[PDB]
Write a protein that binds this DNA or RNA. Structure first.
Length: 813
RNA sequence: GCCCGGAUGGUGGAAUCGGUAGACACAAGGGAUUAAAUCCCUCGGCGUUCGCGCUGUGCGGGUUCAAGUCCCGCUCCGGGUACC
């Protein structure tokens, strides 16, 4: 064994080993309990960022640990490889998106290997390869034939393919109650984004208008307070009136471009269905065209938005709901928003909210001018992009003008990778020959738009279970073996997009017979952002210039706080504190630099120690150095121990009191570390516990046979406890220690519960809650015996609650 | 304005159970060694007769025998949102 720990001589050899032995490749073994550990797959931008390293280290820790518990562990990796940045990069450079992407994949793949993440590399996927996207093309055609896909023009004013995610809204909402092991914050974000709403459509007659006008309200109980209607700028009733009306004309145009209320009177009168009175119809900026019918009824008395509109434009404010105490409401300043009993409403006077809502809804429904309507804030999923670098949409327009999917025997529709980008138009649109095809004996033009990249990331988790299956999108027996994902790790920024889509997609696959389960992932862990110090100076021109923390010459006060800072050019810098890493703040830290500086193990250890997985981590070079010194101390202790050669078998009966208590701490540490990693997922305190035992072990004597056999037990346990964090050093150390086999197949240490019996316990004696004594009594002892002993204590003598083997308190009388 | 988080030493963070506040580490000071590195110790605040005594978890309160933890106010900090 070398005296000095040198990661450059260890890590790349251990990584080769893992490749040659295929250590982390797994099959569908029914003789083992499966564990599927998944980290959000990276986009191949070119280099790993510190957020990748954190995400993937957390994942690797769990995967390695669960393997040592005896599970069959799937930890897959791959590339979300389509998307916008490759188009830009291709143009800036001399190239095309495909080769730029594959070059990045190779470079980033090597980085991941150099960090030593135990992936099953046999299951590696690149989502821009036909072998992957072909299946989402087939799936889309099936969705279309099942009526879940449609085309329409929308404004984000382009025609688009939509998938009917709203057909699954109720279930996506309801099934959140099954997600006990997802964080409340993500669940609440999904609830709010779905935005399920119960209400009533109310249809009106408009006097000089050809059509009826329909509005959506969540508050039909306020309908006798309706003094006008309001329509979106893009509503067709507004477009018609705008022909004669230049005031309205310019208002509509203004609303397309560039929380104040703004409106113009349309001139149209609508007939209130209950009263029969004419009310006016205004165009208003606060009514979204895309939600509900794009038209509301206005009740200024009780909708704050309608209050400010009516107050601005002089329209009537009419009170129809009473205040909580039953008194008529104060409308002189704002709307009365709370639900309450009706007045000023004829039939419906005296009805409380629920009764008013139903009575009015029922009356309108019976008159044929209302119906209950459930809307969602959730929009249908627009999946088409006017971009080249994405999977082609498998749809076609025959010369008929008729539209159908690309036939099965023409799938996949392959994106040609050999292209020159003019930077302006997609190559597959620019070449007019590419679109031309023949379908069903007929000439046709195939879709030129491509899928948004969310399409690929919505199902990769499942394809990892059968990456090479050629028969279908999924092999159901393999998918159901592995799914649902046990833990999914990745940032909270994905909560309302990817984290929703993949649930939807899971449910689509379920409903196609493809998978067995309702939800894709049991636990979601959102790891916190990595932060770094940020500095800037102000130039002579008044512009801020951000300076990398590496380049800051800082001056600290007596207590180590930064009190002044300069760069080498002499610029006075202002320290802005720990912040999110960015190219704009110029404070990003390159993990490759840190891996080459300290070794992958040091970087992994620091990232798992500095902070709880779900909280922000502050990058501190002094912290990384601390981690580096710790591993050197661990290396050092194994080097001195093994230098003394083989050890006798440990004899637990003949151990000394000192030896027994040291052993007890080894085993108590095994228990705590097991619980922190396995149940609490508090990795930072797990490492802390290992550090604390190491400090004790560095002081233990190692000359007697029994001392050396104990140390052997301890070090073999420590090397295993650390292995999920720092597997390169632990792989090597295990061998040095003559452990059986490769550490990766070694069993996780189990605490020997005979070694943990305490004999005595400490008890804190308090008088009026404040500690006066600390005393040692057996776990064996009865309540009297503990107070008897307490009473014999002389500082207790100068001055009744009991917790066994813990505390005794005396309220003074 | 809005929704959802959060506040413990010089710093990151511990305290899982309401029951010894500050584990572990960083920084700093003293020691061994010749600057650096590494290994030996001290380190919440105040007082101190150097043995300890008192105080302390943003500020108020409530429950309790006991609150960093549970409950309610207030202040301040962070993230998310755009008339659904």
């Amino acid at each position: 064994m070398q005296e000095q720990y040198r990661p450059e001589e260890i890590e790349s050899k251990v990584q080769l080993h893992w490749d040659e032995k295929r250590t982390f490749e797994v099959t569908e073994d029914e003789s083992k309990e499966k564990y599927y550990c998944l980290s959000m797959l990276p986009y191949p931008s070119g280099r790993l960022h510190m957020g990748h390293v954190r995400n993937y280290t957390i994942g690797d820790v769990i995967a390695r640990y669960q393997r040592m518990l005896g599970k069959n562990v799937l930890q897959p990796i791959g590339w979300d490889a389509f998307g916008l940045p490759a188009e830009g990069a291709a143009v800036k450079n001399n190239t095309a998106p495909a080769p730029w992407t594959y070059d990045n994949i190779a470079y980033m793949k090597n980085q991941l290997k150099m960090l030593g993440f135990g992936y099953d590399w046999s299951r590696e996927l690149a989502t821009c390869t036909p072998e992957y996207y072909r299946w989402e093309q087939k799936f889309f055609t099936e969705l279309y034939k099942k009526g879940l896909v449609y085309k329409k023009t929308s404004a984000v004013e382009i025609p688009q393919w939509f998938i009917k995610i709203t057909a699954y809204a109720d279930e996506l909402l309801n099934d959140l109650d099954k997600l006990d092991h997802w964080p409340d914050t993500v669940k609440t974000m999904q609830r709010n984004w779905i935005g399920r709403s119960e209400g009533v459509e109310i249809t009106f007659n408009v006097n000089d208008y050809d059509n009826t006008l329909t509005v959506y309200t969540t508050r039909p109980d306020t309908f006798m307070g309706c003094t006008y209607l309001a329509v979106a700028a893009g509503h067709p009733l507004a477009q018609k009136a705008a022909e004669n009306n230049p005031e309205l004309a310019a208002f509509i145009d203004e609303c397309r471009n560039t929380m104040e209320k703004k409106g113009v009177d349309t001139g149209f009168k609508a007939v209130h269905p209950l009263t029969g009175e004419e009310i006016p119809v205004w165009a208003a900026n606060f009514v979204l065209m895309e939600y509900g019918t794009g038209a509301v009824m206005a009740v200024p008395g009780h909708d704050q938005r309608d209050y400010e509109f009516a107050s601005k434009y002089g329209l009537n404010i009419k009170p129809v709901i009473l205040a909580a105490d039953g008194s008529e409401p104060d409308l002189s300043q704002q709307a009365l928003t709370e639900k309450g009993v009706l007045f000023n409403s004829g039939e419906f006077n005296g009805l409380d909210h629920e009764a008013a809502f139903n009575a009015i809804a029922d009356k309108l429904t019976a008159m044929g001018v209302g119906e209950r309507k459930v809307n969602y804030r959730l929009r249908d999923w627009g999946v088409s992009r006017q971009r080249y670098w994405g999977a082609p949409i498998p749809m076609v327009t025959l010369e008929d003008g008729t539209v159908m999917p690309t036939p099965d025997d023409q799938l996949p529709v392959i994106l040609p990778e050999d292209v020159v980008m003019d930077g302006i138009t997609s190559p597959i649109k620019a070449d007019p020959e590419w679109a031309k095809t023949t379908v069903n004996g007929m000439p046709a033009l195939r879709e030129t738009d491509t899928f948004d990249t969310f399409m690929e990331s919505s199902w990769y988790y499942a394809r990892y279970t059968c990456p090479q299956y050629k028969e279908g999108m999924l092999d159901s027996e393999a998918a159901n073996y592995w799914l649902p994902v046990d833990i999914y790790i990745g940032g909270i920024e994905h909560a309302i997009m990817h984290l929703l889509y993949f649930r939807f997609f899971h449910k689509l696959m379920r409903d196609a017979g493809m998978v067995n389960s309702d939800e894709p992932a049991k636990q979601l862990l959102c790891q916190g952002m990595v932060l770094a110090d940020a500095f800037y100076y102000v130039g002579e021109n008044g512009e801020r210039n951000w300076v990398s923390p590496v380049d800051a010459i800082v001056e600290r006060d007596e207590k180590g706080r930064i009190v002044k800072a300069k760069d080498a050019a002499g610029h006075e810098l202002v320290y802005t504190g720990m912040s999110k890493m960015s190219k704009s703040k110029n404070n990003g830290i390159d993990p490759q630099v840190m891996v080459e500086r300290y070794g992958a193990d040091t970087v992994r250890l620091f990232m798992m120690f500095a902070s709880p997985a779900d909280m922000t981590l502050e990058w501190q070079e002094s912290g990384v150095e601390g981690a580096n010194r710790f591993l050197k101390r661990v290396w050092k202790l194994v080097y001195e121990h093994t230098a003394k050669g083989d050890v006798a078998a440990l004899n637990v009966d003949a151990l000394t009191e000192n030896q027994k208590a040291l052993r007890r701490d080894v085993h108590k540490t095994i228990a705590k570390v097991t619980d922190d990693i396995g149940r609490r997922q508090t990795f930072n305190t797990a490492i802390a516990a290992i550090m604390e035992l190491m400090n004790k072990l560095a002081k233990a004597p190692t000359d007697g046979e029994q001392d050396r056999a104990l140390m052997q037990e301890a070090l073999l346990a420590v090397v295993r406890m650390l292995n999920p964090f720092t597997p390169h050093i632990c792989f090597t150390l295990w061998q040095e220690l003559k452990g059986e086999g490769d550490i990766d197949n070694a069993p996780w240490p189990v605490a020997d519960e005979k070694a943990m019996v305490e004999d005595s316990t400490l008890v804190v004696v308090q008088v009026n809650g404040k500690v006066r004594a600390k005393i040692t009594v057996p776990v064996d002892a009865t309540e009297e015996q503990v107070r008897e002993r307490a009473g014999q204590e002389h500082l207790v003598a100068k001055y009744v609650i009991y917790v066994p083997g813990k505390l005794l308190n005396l309220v003074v009388g």
